[PDB]
Ligand binder design. Structure first.
Ligand code: TRP
Ligand code: TRP
Lengths: 104, 104
DNA sequence: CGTACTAGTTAACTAGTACG
DNA sequence: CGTACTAGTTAACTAGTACG
């Protein structure tokens, strides 16, 4: 009896993270932006602004349900379906989401 | 006309950067992955996946224009229109592309 | 008070061929 | 031999209302 893969690494990284390695070369300076004008599009930083704005504004929960859609212009399907993604993720790394709002 | 500084206007984009400061908090550890599962989508690693595939395979030039389409499945309009993006970018920061192509 | 949902229109990307 | 084009389809995202 002998296991195939278990010691050192359990999950294998093939695509999304070899991209996060070149991102840390332009994150020390700030050259991942002319790099994003060659491999992706302006529509990727258009959907980062309004998507990161309904989550950064929902987690506060003061004026974010009926009265928020008029300020930016993002429907009630995106503002409350962004809430459905929070209940699927785990709590050990939802905990880091608290490490980046609370300010420690 | 002027020895130092030419034309005064001042301009800054605040959307992709509210996402780059919180991305640097999870880049020191590695919690930007549960982060990409609740405010990005699985199509955001399918676009960083296949878009980093036609550029990292075009810049070398071995099997990335005609014989590539069957190996993964992206069509000839993405692997040849991705070449048109390089002709628009500048050489001062395309130079950093050499800082991460030669070494990587 | 809050959420979920039913109806409403837009956007990128994919695939095999045409010519320089 | 290396690029770009004609024709083909596959997902994403907006908006305003009603019920628990
Ligand atoms: N994964 C997101 C999908 C999404 C696309 N565009 C959005 C804009 C805002 C919020 C969420 C989204 C969700 O279902 O929640
Ligand atoms: N700006 C890119 C947009 C793009 C979308 N999907 C792609 C796939 C591969 C390469 C580029 C892309 C282009 O037109 O080239």
């Amino acid at each position: 009896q002998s296991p195939y893969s278990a010691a050192m690494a359990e999950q294998r990284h093939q695509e999304w993270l070899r991209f996060v390695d070149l991102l840390k070369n332009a994150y020390q300076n700030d050259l991942h932006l002319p790099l994003l004008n060659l491999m992706l599009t302006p529509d990727e930083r258009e959907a980062l602004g309004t998507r990161v704005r309904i989550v950064e504004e929902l987690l506060r929960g003061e004026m974010s349900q009926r009265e928020l859609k008029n300020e930016l212009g993002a429907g009630i399907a995106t503002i409350t379906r962004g809430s459905n993604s929070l209940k699927a993720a785990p709590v050990e790394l939802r905990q880091w989401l608290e490490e980046v709002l609370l300010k420690s």
